Amino acid sequence: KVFGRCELAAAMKRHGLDNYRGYSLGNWVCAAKFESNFNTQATNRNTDGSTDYGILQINSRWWCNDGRTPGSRNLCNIPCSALLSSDITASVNCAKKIVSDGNGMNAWVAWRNRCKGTDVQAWIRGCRL
């Protein structure tokens, strides 16, 4: 599923992401935009042989099991394939664990480089929430 901006905002709001650990909804939409272009089916391989999965590009090195990242953790306790579903629940539940782990949204390189310190409220402008 490729989400529309407001569609995704509403979905993330329903799943409890607005102001989760102090991050306004705009931050999450901005992150999803640059990580996945709002496509639940996005995958990208890393140089270390890990793979990033889904709308928030969660990394198999730490967070999910894809059966081919030897020595990796499965900290969200999910197959990485679950992160590619049209239903964002698994991605959102995993993201909450990541964002809680001490580094905040700095875990997402595209957030740090493209969202952090910008007007992120722009990303939810116009939406009925």
- Would you please indicate which residues are annotated as catalytic (active-site) residues? 35, 52
Positions touching Na ion (CB under 5 A) are 11, 87-88
Residue 71 CB, shortest distance to Na ion, in Å, is 32
Among 16, 48, 121, 122, binds Cl ion (CB under 5 A): 121
Residues 2-31 that bind Cl ion (CB under 5 A): 24-26
Residue 40 Cα distances to 21, 82, 105, angstroms = 23, 10, 19
CA distances from 44 to 51, 54, 56, 88, 121 (A): 6, 9, 11, 18, 27
Taking a C-beta distance cutoff of 8 angstroms, is the pair 28, 110 a contact?
A: no
Stretch of residues binding Cl ion (CB under 5 A), selected from 8-16, 40-48, 62-70, 107-115 = 107-115
Where do we find the tokens 């493209």? 114
CB of 92 to Na ion, least distance (A): 8
Annotated binding site for substrate: 101
